[PDB]
Design an enzyme around this catalytic site. Structure first.
Site, short mmCIF file in Angstrom:
data_model
loop_
_atom_site.label_atom_id
_atom_site.label_comp_id
_atom_site.label_asym_id
_atom_site.label_seq_id
_atom_site.Cartn_x
_atom_site.Cartn_y
_atom_site.Cartn_z
N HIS A 93 0.75 -1.15 -0.03
CA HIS A 93 0.03 0.02 0.06
C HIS A 93 0.70 1.25 -0.02
O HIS A 93 0.32 2.36 0.21
CB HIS A 93 -1.02 -0.01 1.14
N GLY A 126 1.68 6.22 10.49
CA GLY A 126 3.21 5.91 10.05
C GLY A 126 3.85 4.83 10.62
O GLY A 126 5.15 4.91 10.34
N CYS A 183 2.94 1.81 9.86
CA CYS A 183 2.92 0.68 8.99
C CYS A 183 4.45 0.05 8.27
O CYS A 183 5.17 0.82 8.33
CB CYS A 183 2.06 1.31 7.64
#
Ligand SMILES: CC[C@@]1(C(=O)Nc2cncc3ccccc23)CNS(=O)(=O)c2ccc(Cl)cc21
Ligand SMILES: [Cl-]
Lengths: 305, 305
Positions: free
Chosen positions: A41, A143, A145
């Site tokens: 993503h 942030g 991820c």
């Protein structure tokens, strides 16, 4: 003495954390040898996130559109393939701090350590369990991820998780290091809901065994139960069904304390029907289920890496 | 979203752990530059522990009486001084992995991470607080002496603790990295007792502010209280006296949520009265006191729910 939720030393994993930037998006990456692993993503915008076509979006990006940064040094991307929901970025430089590693898919009830990062910079480490409903009750802000879940066995770091998204109820969903999601979740902006959770029975049992080892015996009673009669009661309190494998795995603990598994099951049965009654086991007013039978034997023996 | 007890990444501290052996005794040491720091009771036998004369025991020791081991490599001791209760061993090799460090003496209510080691080998990391009674509820087995407590703020590791002993109630006592004990404790096998513990009021308050930030408001009420009336009630439930410094320190949190400190105090006063009533704040059935006002601002977002 003492019983704390403990995590594995994060040092081996800290040396692998890089920052992946693709356009406006910036998340975390795992750098092992000449490959950086991160959520696919990263290529997505907030417009693309509704119904994305990841193959069509990847075929458009060139190598230099992905800025991988290791500390203050910049890394040069020379390739980009995709495996399920993880994007694998071939870099020019091998990570000199690559540890001895393996990629493992863990089962619900199995615990792991999470090295929470923001912009390729480790900020915290904590222990958590893969819930029966495949979600994890983690602690993550935007942030985070690309943060990874790991376990160390001897000198080998077993990578078992990569953070992808947070669900509306505050729970988290991620994939194994091969991009395969844990649970019925997909990587996109949709109405996804965490399922009805259950308590990990084999972990609560292990945590009661650790309490007996640490001197708490108030919950013990003279009674025992059959594995079937226990499971009927467990089902009524949203507890995971205890299997004959679970019983065997609690064997070393049963031998060390001197309390049979079905003897300890009967203590838990009475804790479910009647409660704590103003008392606490190992400093808790709730029954703790994020300590596996192995975690208890590790903390109450002293296993070093 | 999410609220977990988090520990600092242990990597910077892992690279400092060595194994100190002096005769039959083997504990942990902290190797920074050309100095290894460890408990001075390494020179002691189980006979000496009752009334040890550390000066007399150290003067009988030569550099070779110490075997410092860093991983598989042996280290050569070239000096031995003593500072309070810590033994400082000058070695002939500077630690190439020495991080940017400081030695800090923390005050009760402050939290820190603990890298638990056995025979210079790190085995786990966890977060804990310096209790009002100067003890720490850690998770330590024998041979963990010399394990350190740290806080990594920015790129600097602040060393605030070294494990020395475990009291009869299962709590732990250690010193700052200058050998000065935390509390009325001595490195002597005498009748030492942990004082009556109290709950850290300023940390419970901070933890309630984190709950409000994470969306929970069920515990709040329309009442407010005077700092004095709050302290009288708090002392009844074995809570630490809240000071005017404590109130000020909760200022940034008070402004972010929009609930005055004495307003939040009255929500806690009621919580101490009725209890939880089958509900949980931030996933806990107990009032959590090991999250400082600084820890909450560090972990929680500035976006309130
Ligand atoms: C020589 C260390 C020792 C100790 O407490 N060791 C320990 C430290 N941490 C966890 C322990 C878990 C189990 C067993 C011992 C533990 C031994 N007991 S003592 O009362 O003689 C004692 C007294 C003072 C000092 Cl500063 C050290 C010590
Ligand atoms: Cl402090």
């Amino acid at each position: 003495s003492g019983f704390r939720k403990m995590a594995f030393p994060s040092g081996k994993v800290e040396g692998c954390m890089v920052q992946v930037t693709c356009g406006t998006t910036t998340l975390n990456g795992l750098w092992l040898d000449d490959v950086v692993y991160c959520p696919r993503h990263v290529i997505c915008t907030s417009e693309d996130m509704l119904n994305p076509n990841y193959e069509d979006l990847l075929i458009r990006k060139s190598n230099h559109n992905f800025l991988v940064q290791a500390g203050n040094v910049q890394l040069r991307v020379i390739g980009h393939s995709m495996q399920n929901c993880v994007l694998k970025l071939k870099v020019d430089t091998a990570n000199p701090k690559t540890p001895k590693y393996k990629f493992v898919r863990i089962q619900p009830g199995q615990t792991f350590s999470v090295l929470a990062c923001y912009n390729g910079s480790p900020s915290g480490v904590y222990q958590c369990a893969m819930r029966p409903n495949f979600t994890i009750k983690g602690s993550f802000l935007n942030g985070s991820c690309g943060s990874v879940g790991f376990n160390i066995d001897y000198d080998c770091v077993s990578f078992c998780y990569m953070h992808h998204m947070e669900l509306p109820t505050g729970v988290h969903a991620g994939t194994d290091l091969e991009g395969n999601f844990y649970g019925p979740f997909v990587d996109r902006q949709t109405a996804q809901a965490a399922g009805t959770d259950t308590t990990i029975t084999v972990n609560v049992l292990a945590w009661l065994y650790a309490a007996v080892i640490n001197g708490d015996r108030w919950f013990l009673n003279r009674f025992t139960t059959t594995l079937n009669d226990f499971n009927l009661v467990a089902m009524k309190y949203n507890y995971e069904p205890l299997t004959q494998d679970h019983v065997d795995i609690l064997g070393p603990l049963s031998a060390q304390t001197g309390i049979a598994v079905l003897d300890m099951c009967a203590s838990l049965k009475e804790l479910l029907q009647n409660g704590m009654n103003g008392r606490t086991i190992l400093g808790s007013a709730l029954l703790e289920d994020e300590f596996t039978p192995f975690d208890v034997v590790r903390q109450c023996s002293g296993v070093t890496f």
